[PDB]
Ligand binder design. Structure first.
Ligand SMILES: CCCCCCCCCCCCCC(=O)SCCNC(=O)CCNC(=O)[C@H](O)C(C)(C)COP(=O)(O)OP(=O)(O)OC[C@H]1O[C@@H](n2cnc3c(N)ncnc32)[C@H](O)[C@@H]1OP(=O)(O)O
Ligand SMILES: Cc1nn(C)c(C)c1CCOc1c(-c2ccc3c(c2)c(CN(C)C)nn3C)ccc(F)c1F
Ligand SMILES: [Cl-]
Length: 385
């Protein structure tokens, strides 16, 4: 309603809208020399802490903070449980900066109570490519909510990003803020349907008995693209071409270098899965999904929902439906309970046929210090972790 913090920031007002001829910063001609060199003031008893995510102990402190205090679903039934190895992968992409991994400690206990992170990436927005920061993993301890700590974290990481002569950022949130460039509902494809029913993720009715639900979501254990196999280092050049060509159609996407392709797609158990179809030495199809479990709050039988999240998928030798059918199958083969996807890129066109259910909310895409026309989520070509 009031947006007292966000209306001090270079972002659109709630009722602002720009036509497609507008694609530029709110504030231009920024000078690194004029950026503040002092850290933002914290309340007494709290201090900034630079986290070394490559140090197991520092990384474990971040892991604990998020496990206990990060995103929950709208009904406080699930809480994200990013693994420590996932956080390593998500935060140490090519040319990342340690000083963009910012913690807040409570001095008396020496314990982390706040975190925010960014990584650098080239972002193409309406065909214009801008060096940006991708902001993620903003988290304040549950006991310290609504004390205006989040604006301090946001202003401090803004300052540190500006020190590197970067003046734009991309971020996503479930909360509505000024002002989304796009808004994407999420959908869920049941794989282990008995577990999903028992934990309250899915439901039954008189027409859909347990046995009927299990049969509805049963899948054939045979791939439409028979040679889909785990990506290897030799495939980096081919994935770079296949995905890079595909993404140029969208209004918002990351312009991956080959080093970034290797980092974001080479498979890591329980973190990132990429499968490729190689034909005549060329990569002609790819499937990828990442592992993001949710802790199941207060369930005595199951502690974790094992969820695969659709990442980037491209096909040239099958239909997109056939490709995403294989994606579901590959997630099932890797013991995931549910396959989750946003209505971005071509995804929505397969949701009905492949038996996805609509979820309870949406993920909003935002840019910082950029004015441009908004667009439908099918024009979004980027997925943030
Ligand atoms: C050039 C470089 C620029 C770099 C920066 C680019 C921007 C990056 C922006 C960050 C991108 C994050 C990407 C992700 O990580 S999205 C993941 C967000 N994390 C969670 O949801 C975890 C669980 N919740 C929490 O930890 C806290 O509730 C957080 C920390 C989220 C808010 O803490 P708290 O609830 O204790 O609130 P407060 O009293 O301190 O602060 C209230 C103010 O903060 C605004 N708020 C609330 N939630 C969010 C949110 N998710 N993005 C942006 N702003 C948010 C809110 O509208 C209000 O402002 P205004 O309404 O009064 O104006
Ligand atoms: C399961 C589950 N367990 N928990 C704890 C939730 C919230 C869910 C729903 C997940 O919804 C998503 C999200 C999705 C939706 C909201 C999100 C997120 C992802 C993120 C993480 N990144 C993108 C910032 N933050 N927020 C607020 C992104 C892509 C999807 F395909 C989803 F199904
Ligand atoms: Cl200020």
């Amino acid at each position: 309603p009031d947006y007292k913090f966000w209306y001090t920031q270079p972002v659109p007002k709630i009722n602002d809208e720009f036509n497609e001829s507008v694609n530029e910063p709110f504030i231009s001609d920024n000078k690194v020399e004029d950026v503040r060199k002092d850290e933002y003031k914290l309340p007494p008893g709290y201090s900034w802490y630079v986290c070394d995510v490559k140090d197991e102990k520092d990384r474990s402190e971040i892991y604990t903070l998020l496990t206990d205090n990060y995103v929950e679903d709208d009904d406080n039934i699930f809480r994200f449980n990013y693994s420590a190895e996932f956080l390593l992968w998500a935060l140490t992409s090519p040319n990342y900066l340690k000083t963009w991994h910012i913690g807040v400690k409570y001095d008396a206990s020496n314990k982390l109570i706040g975190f925010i992170s960014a990584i650098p990436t080239d972002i193409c927005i309406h065909k214009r490519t801008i060096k940006m920061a991708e902001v993620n993993f903003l988290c304040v301890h549950k006991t310290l909510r609504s004390k205006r700590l989040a604006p301090v974290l946001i202003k401090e990481i803004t300052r540190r990003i500006n020190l590197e002569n970067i003046w734009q950022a991309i971020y996503t949130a479930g909360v509505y803020l000024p002002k989304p460039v796009s808004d994407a509902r999420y959908y869920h494809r049941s794989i282990n349907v008995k577990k999903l029913i028992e934990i309250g993720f899915s439901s039954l009715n008189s027409r859909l008995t347990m046995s009927r639900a299990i049969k509805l979501y049963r899948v054939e254990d045979t791939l439409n693209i028979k040679n889909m196999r785990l990506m290897k280092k030799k495939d980096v050049e081919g994935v770079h071409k296949l995905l890079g060509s595909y993404l140029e159609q969208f209004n918002l996407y990351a312009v991956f270098t080959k080093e970034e392709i290797a980092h974001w797609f080479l498979p890591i158990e329980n973190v990132i899965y990429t499968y490729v179809n190689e034909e005549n030495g060329k990569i002609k199809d790819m499937i990828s999904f990442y592992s993001l479990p949710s802790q199941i709050l207060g369930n005595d039988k199951y502690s974790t929902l094992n969820a695969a999240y659709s990442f980037y998928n491209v096909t040239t030798t099958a239909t997109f439906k056939q490709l995403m059918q294989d994606a579901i199958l590959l997630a099932k083969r890797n013991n995931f309970d549910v396959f989750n996807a946003l209505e971005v890129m071509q995804n929505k066109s397969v949701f009905e046929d492949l038996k996805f259910g609509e979820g309870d909310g949406s993920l909003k895409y935002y840019l910082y210090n950029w004015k441009c026309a908004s667009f439908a989520p099918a024009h979004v070509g980027i997925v943030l972790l």
